[PDB]
From TrEMBL, chain E:
Gene Ontology CC entries for this record: cytosolic large ribosomal subunit
Gene: rplN
Swiss-Prot/TrEMBL GO biological process terms: translation
Gene3D superfamilies: Ribosomal protein L14
Protein source organism: Escherichia coli KTE182
Biological role: Binds to 23S rRNA. Forms part of two intersubunit bridges in the 70S ribosome.
Protein name: Large ribosomal subunit protein uL14
Pfam families: Ribosomal_L14
Amino acid sequence: MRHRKSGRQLNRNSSHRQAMFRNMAGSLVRHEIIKTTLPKAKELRRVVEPLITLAKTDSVANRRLAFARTRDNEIVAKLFNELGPRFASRAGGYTRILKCGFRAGDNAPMAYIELVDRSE
Amino acid sequence: MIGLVGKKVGMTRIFTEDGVSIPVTVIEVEANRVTQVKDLANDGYRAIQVTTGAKKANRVTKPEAGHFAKAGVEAGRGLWEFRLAEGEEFTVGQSISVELFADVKKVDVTGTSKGKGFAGTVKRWNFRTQDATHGNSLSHRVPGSIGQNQTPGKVFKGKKMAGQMGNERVTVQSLDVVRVDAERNLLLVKGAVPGATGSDLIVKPAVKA
Amino acid sequence: SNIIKQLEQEQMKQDVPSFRPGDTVEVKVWVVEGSKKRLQAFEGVVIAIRNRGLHSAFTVRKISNGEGVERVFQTHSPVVDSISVKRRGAVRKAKLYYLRERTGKAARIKERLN
Amino acid sequence: MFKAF
Amino acid sequence: MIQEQTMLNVADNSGARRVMCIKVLGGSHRRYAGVGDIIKITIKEAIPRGKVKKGDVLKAVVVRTKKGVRRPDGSVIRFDGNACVLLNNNSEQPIGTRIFGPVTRELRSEKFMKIISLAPEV
Amino acid sequence: AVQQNKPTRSKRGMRRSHDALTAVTSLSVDKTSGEKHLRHHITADGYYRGRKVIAK
RNA sequence: AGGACCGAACCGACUAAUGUUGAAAAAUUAGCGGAUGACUUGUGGCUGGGGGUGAAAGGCCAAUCAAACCGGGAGAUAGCU
RNA sequence: CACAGGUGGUCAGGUAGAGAAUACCAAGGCGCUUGAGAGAACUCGGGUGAAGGAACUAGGCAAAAUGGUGCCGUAACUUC
RNA sequence: AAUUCCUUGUCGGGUAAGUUCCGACCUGCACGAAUGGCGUAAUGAUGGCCAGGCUGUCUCCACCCGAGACUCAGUGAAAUU
RNA sequence: GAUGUCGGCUCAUCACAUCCUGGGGCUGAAGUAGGUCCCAAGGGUAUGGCUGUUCGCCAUUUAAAGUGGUACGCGAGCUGGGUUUAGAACGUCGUGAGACAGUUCGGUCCCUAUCUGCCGUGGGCGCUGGAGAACUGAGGGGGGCUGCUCCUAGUACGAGAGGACCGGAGUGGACGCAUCACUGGUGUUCGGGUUGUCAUGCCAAUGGCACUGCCCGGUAGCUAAAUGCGGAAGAGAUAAGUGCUGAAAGCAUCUAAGCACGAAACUUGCCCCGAGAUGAGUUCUCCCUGACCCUUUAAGGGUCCUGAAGGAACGUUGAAGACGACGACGUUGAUAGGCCGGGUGUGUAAGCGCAGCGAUGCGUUGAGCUAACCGGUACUAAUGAACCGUGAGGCUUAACCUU
Ligand SMILES: [Mg+2]
Ligand SMILES: [Mg+2]
Ligand SMILES: [Mg+2]
Ligand SMILES: [Mg+2]
Ligand SMILES: [Mg+2]
Ligand SMILES: [Mg+2]
Ligand SMILES: [Mg+2]
Ligand SMILES: [Mg+2]
Ligand SMILES: [Mg+2]
Ligand SMILES: [Mg+2]
Ligand SMILES: [Mg+2]
Ligand SMILES: [Mg+2]
Ligand SMILES: [Mg+2]
Ligand SMILES: [Mg+2]
Ligand SMILES: [Mg+2]
Ligand SMILES: [Mg+2]
Ligand SMILES: [Mg+2]
Ligand SMILES: [Mg+2]
Ligand SMILES: [Mg+2]
Ligand SMILES: [Mg+2]
Ligand SMILES: [Mg+2]
Ligand SMILES: [Mg+2]
Ligand SMILES: [Mg+2]
Ligand SMILES: [Mg+2]
Ligand SMILES: [Mg+2]
Ligand SMILES: [Mg+2]
Ligand SMILES: [Mg+2]
Ligand SMILES: [Mg+2]
Ligand SMILES: [Mg+2]
Ligand SMILES: [Mg+2]
Ligand SMILES: [Mg+2]
Ligand SMILES: [Mg+2]
Ligand SMILES: [Mg+2]
């Protein structure tokens, strides 16, 4: 059964699944918009968005905590220096998912995921 | 005897002065409003149709709205019927609350049980599993034999096999009414009842008596 | 769950003292022998506590007449009359199940001299 | 292939 | 939960140290004996010069179990080991003249009042 | 394990009666770009709900 | 010193599961035996079918062995299907 | 067969280690030529388990368990 | 008894209960002395039996992590008839 | 030109020549307990030691541990211990190769389900206008076991010993259903400890890998060992059986006419499915009130206008689920995520200071972190539409409403 459970297995083990989202989370921070499969984008919200909330308050402990979850100082600097201040007023919902058809290689349903403040 | 429709709030413990702990399922029974009364001369049997709760008017269909408007009642979660005995009579639009069970000692609670989905014979029918070792080959929890060779040459009706389990109407009988709280529309019954939290629930006086 | 929450809150004991795992706690529990009620004391080390509001409970371990005994008390049950902290112990864990494998000197617990 | 003697 | 082949310590001074349960009495297909239940036992180890000897087949009443005992309020009482008191096969009365270790309240029956009177604790 | 008789043309046809595909009921029309697209999906030129969400 | 001991490489193949239209016409995985010797291995050579070789199982002699393989007698014979 | 097989030599880094075992790495080389979802039964490869502990079974099959260094200590039987 | 048909021979030990096992008896159907008799320390992936530890082997299964099964896209078999 | 064999395991189904429970007649039936026969198949109807065994003996239970059929039920379900391939040996027979319902040690169990069958779950069409709901219940299935203690009562009975029927109450075993409040398991998505090594420049702090590296705890969910409930009363017609009145047959006679009682069997009562019940049922609401054209002039075809109730599709999703299906919701919005608060779990984070040569300790501090949970919040995603479905619904007869 699967009653009241959360988190997609995505046909991966725990180690691979954790590593993949760490890489994907850094990509979304580095590139404000990325293209991924629809189910993967839905799971990425539960990983990237907490990091942005963590970046709301700038402190040594928070930066180290963010580093432990991203293992990329460039991402940590991006989160606390730019993303944190930009989303300081938003109460969640820092990312938006847009469906963009299906993948030619395997017909997988794709979707764009981007930060809501990409406007320039 | 007429019953009421409620919702499964959850399970809770009730302590008593003597030191006994009574596990009680909390059932909320809002005002049950009678929507239609079935008459022998018109429907062939005596019964009442009632509705409980409320639902957003945006999702109320026109044919459903007219039925409620006929009795001058607000749309509810759904419609349920209760058969009437010889001495029972009700009027359309009447509101029935949990005080009906104030003098009732035993009740029968019916509801849709939890849905287990496709279940094997071991879980569904308590089939004994075969040896996990000692040479067993891909038959650790398979059903096993299902017939008796040529003579019957077939599988009989009702053979116990894997299939959908749960998610069906189930009735539990002779549950003690621990407490009736009319001020809060709450009914406490000793023991568990079918269904998950928030599922529709039907409570009737114990027919077994 | 507001309905459930207030139902339990209305019957939760208010005089529950503060204690931690590893503390030596004496529990007064009502016992009935015929028509007369009585109080008997159960003193031991608190090895486990679960906080669940009205469903909170704690486990007390003692060695009685050479036999280890563990009692799981329902914190808010009327059966237990009172709880008293005789001594405070210093432990690094919430659960002290490892004490089940120890006796005598090995089972000693340091005092929490805050 | 089973036998029968 | 005491089954067949389960080894239990002896809570009385009858001379037996530990016994094996060979039958859970009181029903058909019954497989568990709790506190206060009678079980057929065989003595596996005993002291010399005791009133019982190794290999004897008797019946005993379970007084302590690891699984524990459930109280009306939901509390549980557990012991570090399983213990029993030997009883006469024909009269099912206690054989030993003393009881060792604590005893549990569900022995409060007219047929076990002797054990409670000798019980050091409750 | 294996068939004892050869299934007919008829049997094959009725088994495939449920294999037919279903066409999309309709295509949404963007309020600004006017291009047809799957509902709740961005258009070919990156428009969605009247906004050019995608740069390309 | 050792057909000595424990144990990798190396050479074996005792148990179990999987596989059995297999990844594989004999394997994989986890254990297992020998591991300075009657050991193991590379290259080349010799023994040819009623013969070879065989610490001997009728084992092996090119996925074939109580008489190899290829061609020939040959369209053997078949009171049988 | 772009096949979980078979195939003789030479080179032999770092930390821990008795070690060419094993673990993580360097130089270097790879992710094994269908993917994307779902998280039913059942099958396969594994993890954990209340109380009991061979009651299983043809049989403790399989699993679990023991597991290293020094030091103390070690019986019958021995062809010593 | 790797030998005993009668046979689960009889007696003793082990177990609450032992057609197996160990010891003994001799009524050896049908042991026996280099196609060797009887012993034998050590050795054995050897046969039988018992005990401690150990455990999902089991009472009685429960949950969980992965690869299939299931759905979608691509490619696309087989025995049989 | 193949129907695999004993026994075990799993799963069974039927018969009644009935093992237990139920109802009776006799008894050399005082009571308790038995013997024998009749009715009764609804439910129930042991775990172990030895042996490959079925069987059997033995140990200890039980209300009882029934007898049989079903390819001596069941290997395209499992096992392979026993017989019965090739190896080897003993005894025995034969000069010998070999041989033995003689014995010993070892010894490959293949098949992706087309059909029937069965367990589940959908699509299509039908039910005569269409649509949304709630129902009647023809039919079918599930369930049906039983111990002990107490009271009646140490009463009836009996010289004593011993010890009830009939009726009540309580508490159990086995089995079934439901559920997580409790007690627990699991909890590789939550904390913490720790070994080796590598990396982030280094210290500090962290991360990767080693079965989740090895471990200690644990939220939700699932779950049993956990805790609630269930078997029935009652009614109808009866079996064996017991009767009332009563002739044939002046009597007698339960029977021929006519009445009464009578069991876990039967029909109901209880639970579940159920109008594909084509015999396709009933009740309550909702929706549609246009133009014409053609001849093969009839339940006829076609164009224009129209597109309702409702459905579907898509999207966010569920304690619903293999996929379909089913339930919730789509801005007039709490469906999911995030966010805020709280609760849980872990157990005093990091940084800094103070003590110590140091490991480390202490203060800040029950700190930090915290998954699925609880109560909230439109911050993100659930689009304005399109699509399907129509336009008053056949004939005959009858009864009313009428002209
Ligand atoms: Mg996949
Ligand atoms: Mg890992
Ligand atoms: Mg479900
Ligand atoms: Mg196999
Ligand atoms: Mg297996
Ligand atoms: Mg068969
Ligand atoms: Mg037939
Ligand atoms: Mg050697
Ligand atoms: Mg190997
Ligand atoms: Mg070696
Ligand atoms: Mg031979
Ligand atoms: Mg060959
Ligand atoms: Mg010729
Ligand atoms: Mg020819
Ligand atoms: Mg390849
Ligand atoms: Mg290596
Ligand atoms: Mg799985
Ligand atoms: Mg266990
Ligand atoms: Mg057995
Ligand atoms: Mg083994
Ligand atoms: Mg192991
Ligand atoms: Mg034994
Ligand atoms: Mg002997
Ligand atoms: Mg001889
Ligand atoms: Mg050897
Ligand atoms: Mg495909
Ligand atoms: Mg044939
Ligand atoms: Mg009946
Ligand atoms: Mg047979
Ligand atoms: Mg068989
Ligand atoms: Mg065999
Ligand atoms: Mg023969
Ligand atoms: Mg460091």
